[PDB]
Amino acid sequence: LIVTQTMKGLDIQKVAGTWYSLAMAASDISLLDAQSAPLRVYVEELKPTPEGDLEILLQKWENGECAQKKIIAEKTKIPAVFKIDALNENKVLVLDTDYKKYLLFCMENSAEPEQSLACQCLVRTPEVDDEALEKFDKALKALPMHIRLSFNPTQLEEQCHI
Ligand SMILES: CCCCCCCCCC(=O)O
Ligand SMILES: [Cl-]
């Protein structure tokens, strides 16, 4: 795979707290298409553990309902890159953040050709941050994305952005 945008000097303890999935993009349409597509996940909160792992609370559509999830992303030697345990190796990379307004991250299946990738623009507040979106869109220029979604403040205050 392919994301070579990573934040230098990341302090993971400082991303802790409330986030909103303002926008999402993926390499393949089917990753985000359906309400229950695999990477259509809505971030609720980031909880870095005191040993530097990253616990992720999120919502996902799974029954005919919005199910809650807890994902644990384990630290690696690279401060901006974490690994989620599965039948396959898949990583979380933090591309950019200011901790207090926005965070840009991607998730990719490692590895390899390249294939499969989804990125989000996270913001602290249920508001459309055009500047965070502009940085998201800048980051995505380097990537082979084929679907992009964006949410309005009303959806951002609903479960699964309904
Ligand atoms: C630093 C932002 C962390 C958010 C990463 C969300 C990972 C969800 C991957 C999944 O379970 O499909
Ligand atoms: Cl790490």
Side-chain angles (χ1 to χ4, degrees):
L1 328 316
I2 200 96
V3 204
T4 69
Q5 332 176 68
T6 231
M7 169 95 175
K8 317 183 83 180
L10 185 59
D11 180 358
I12 198 64
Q13 292 297 336
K14 295 187 57 187
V15 304
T18 296
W19 297 96
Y20 287 85
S21 294
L22 177 54
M24 327 173 161
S27 51
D28 305 283
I29 293 171
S30 53
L31 291 177
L32 289 190
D33 211 6
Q35 211 184 355
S36 84
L39 287 322
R40 189 103 158 236
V41 295
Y42 307 92
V43 178
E44 179 205 334
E45 170 198 351
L46 295 183
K47 325 160 86 152
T49 82
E51 52 285 53
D53 285 341
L54 186 65
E55 274 195 356
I56 313 146
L57 301 183
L58 59 282
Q59 306 158 348
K60 209 211 177 303
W61 197 267
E62 251 175 10
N63 326 41
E65 64 184 349
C66 187
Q68 316 296 132
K69 299 263 152 46
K70 179 152 85 202
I71 292 319
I72 168 91
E74 314 198 283
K75 71 172 189 192
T76 62
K77 257 101 147 201
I78 305 155
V81 170
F82 301 80
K83 211 188 287 178
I84 294 159
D85 30 275
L87 35 156
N88 19 243
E89 209 210 356
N90 307 102
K91 335 211 153 157
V92 177
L93 313 85
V94 175
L95 319 202
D96 186 29
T97 184
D98 70 0
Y99 314 100
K100 102 277 168 153
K101 293 199 299 172
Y102 82 90
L103 188 141
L104 316 173
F105 81 88
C106 297
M107 309 160 271
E108 63 175 40
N109 185 344
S110 25
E112 32 86 29
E114 93 278 5
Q115 80 226 327
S116 254
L117 161 78
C119 307
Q120 305 195 175
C121 180
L122 292 188
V123 294
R124 282 303 195 171
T125 214
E127 285 182 302
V128 179
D129 187 343
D130 293 320
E131 292 101 64
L133 284 180
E134 199 201 313
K135 295 184 153 166
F136 188 53
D137 284 330
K138 291 313 94 28
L140 258 23
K141 230 160 44 48
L143 314 165
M145 300 316 212
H146 301 268
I147 177 163
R148 175 203 193 287
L149 307 178
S150 209
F151 299 97
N152 69 42
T154 299
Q155 298 171 142
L156 286 183
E157 280 292 293
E158 305 277 336
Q159 281 285 121
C160 285
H161 294 195
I162 224 56

